[PDB]
Structure formats: C-alpha cells, structure tokens
Write a protein that binds this ligand. Structure first.
Ligand code: ZN
Ligand code: ZN
Ligand code: ZN
Ligand code: ZN
Length: 315
C-alpha cells in the first residue's frame, strides 16, 4: 500500500508488559512478524507488536477514523473526536461505542487510549475523579475477543499476547492478577482495587475483574506464612535486581523492614523486629528445597538465593 500506518523514524507510544505507555521511535518495521523494533527514551530497543503501538495523527487526519482509516460517515455511526488527543473514531470503531456529542456521561468524552494513558499508574490506577470513573466505564468491555485467544497449556500466556483491560502484552508472574472467573490476567497498573503495589511473583490473592463483575473489581489478600514471606521477598528482589544472591543484613532484611506495611502480611504485622529478623532468617536457612545459602565471611555477608525460577506456590 502507499501509506503504511507505521514507518521507520516515527515517534510512537508503545504499551509495555506492565500495561503502561512509553515514548519511543520506530527503528525497523517487520511485516512478516508484525512487529516493530522500537527505541525508547533510555535507548533500550525491543520488538513491539503492532497492536501495542500508537502513532500521533498527521495534519489533515481529523477526517479519518484513527482505527479504520476511513472517511465515510453513515447514520448511526458518526465520527467522534477525542477531546484529549483530538484523534477521531467511528462510534462503532471504539470500545465501548463512542457517544455522539452531548450524549456522554461526564462533562465530556475522551478515548480509551487517553483514559488509560492518564489513569494507569505503577502501583495501581487512579481511584478517584473523572478519569478514574471513565476508566471504570471503559473496563466493562475488552478491546479484543476473549474466546479467540490461543492459550498455552497452563493458561499463563497466549499467542496473541492480549491481556488485561488494555489488551497489552504481559507476563503473568510479573505484577499481574488472574481473574477467578475468566482466568484472564490483568496488570497491576490497570486495576483500581489495590491498597499496595504487588510483589513480583505474588499470587496470594483472589481477584475478580470488572468485566466479570459488571462493575468495580473485587480483591482479597490471602494470609502468608513466614516461608512465603521469605520466598516472595527473594523472588521480588531477584526480579527487581536481576541477580540470584542477596545479602541478608544489607539487602533482604532492610527491604522487608522498609517495605513492611506494603507487604500486606496480615497477622504477622506486629512481629517485633528482633523476632522479625530471626523468623525470616530461620525461614531462609531451613527450607533448602527453596533457598540456597552462601557466605562471604571476610565481607561479613550471609547470602540467600532461590533454587527455582517459578514464583512461590500458593498454599
Ligand atoms: Zn493492562
Ligand atoms: Zn472507523
Ligand atoms: Zn484520545
Ligand atoms: Zn474476569
């Protein structure tokens, strides 16, 4: 065709596996694999699926639905403009169907991409205000067909890499929650029900999504045991820091101490520090099936790391 949607040198927003949008520049378009090599603001380069790439509108493209690229307007399906990004959508090209002017619910209408761009946040999306309310509205619908997804055997990943309310990519074990009803996975940043950010690898939750609920999410934090605490802290640090071994006194205990309330430890919350340390140390030292230990006595280091790559079992 004479006018591709994407091209080398184009500035774009790309949705990452955390559901968030990052600014980048397209370096390569691969039409065989339907991906682009995108260079981000830290100069990192990654392949991104075309579905997860949004370019800006060119001058002269208010005539055009940004989804289907078409001019045409027919009765019942008009073009509507986003009052944020000023891109245009056919009512039926937007999910959910975009309201005709003056027929919306709030002060005004802003598109799904913009609502998510403004409302999603690391640690959990905005909970209060117009964008938070608009996001909840958007989240009652999915922008992809759930039933068509090609899942792996354990229902952890699908070939389309369509997850969550956003339809972005994602890694089930990295700050995502699985809905108990539809078994789809949802990003931390796209949810509105958490009181604290998720530990990587933490599945000690029960979750039900907005689509299944037909309204606000429901979530509950399950009770951890000390072995679960040790395993989850080590997993989280392993992911955050991309290394295997962590020093107890310099890294593990301070992390647990400094982030204590965020770990949502339930009944373990008032463990009095000295006992905090010894209980955690005991868990790390005693479960050799989970934890490998090491020593560097000349540096006064006591090291622990995980045996297994998989996140802690939920029991
Ligand atoms: Zn998401
Ligand atoms: Zn359209
Ligand atoms: Zn918009
Ligand atoms: Zn669900």
């Amino acid at each position: 065709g004479p006018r591709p949607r994407l091209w080398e040198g184009q500035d774009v927003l790309a949705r990452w596996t955390d559901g968030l949008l990052y600014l980048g520049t397209i370096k390569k378009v691969d039409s065989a694999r339907e991906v682009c090599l995108v260079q981000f603001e830290d100069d990192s380069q990654f392949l991104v699926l075309w579905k997860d790439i949004s370019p800006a509108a060119l001058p002269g493209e208010e005539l055009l639905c940004c989804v289907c690229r078409s001019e045409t307007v027919v009765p019942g399906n008009r073009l509507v403009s986003c009052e944020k990004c000023r891109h245009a959508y056919h009512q039926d090209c937007h999910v959910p169907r975009a309201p005709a002017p003056g027929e919306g619910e709030g002060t005004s209408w802003v598109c799904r991409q913009c609502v998510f761009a403004i409302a999603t946040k690391r640690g959990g999306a905005l909970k209060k205000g117009p964008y938070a309310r608009a996001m909840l509205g958007m989240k009652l619908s999915l922008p992809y067909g759930l039933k068509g997804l090609d899942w792996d055997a354990g229902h952890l990943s699908n070939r389309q890499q369509s997850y969550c309310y956003c339809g972005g990519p994602g890694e089930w074990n990295l700050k995502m929650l699985q809905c108990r009803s539809c078994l789809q996975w949802f990003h931390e940043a796209c949810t509105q029900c958490l009181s604290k950010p998720l530990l990587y690898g933490d599945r000690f939750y029960e979750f039900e999504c907005c689509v299944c609920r037909g309204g606000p999410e429901k979530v509950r934090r399950l009770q951890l045991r000390w072995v679960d605490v040790a395993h989850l802290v080590l997993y989280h640090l392993s992911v955050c820091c991309k290394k295997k071994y962590f020093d107890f006194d310099r890294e593990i205990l301070p992390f647990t101490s400094e982030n204590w309330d965020s770990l949502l430890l339930g009944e373990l919350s008032d463990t009095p520090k000295g006992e905090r340390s010894s209980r955690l140390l005991s868990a790390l030292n005693s479960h050799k099936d989970r934890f490998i230990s090491g020593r560097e006595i000349k540096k006064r280091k006591c090291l622990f790391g995980l045996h297994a790559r998989m996140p802690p079992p939920v029991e």
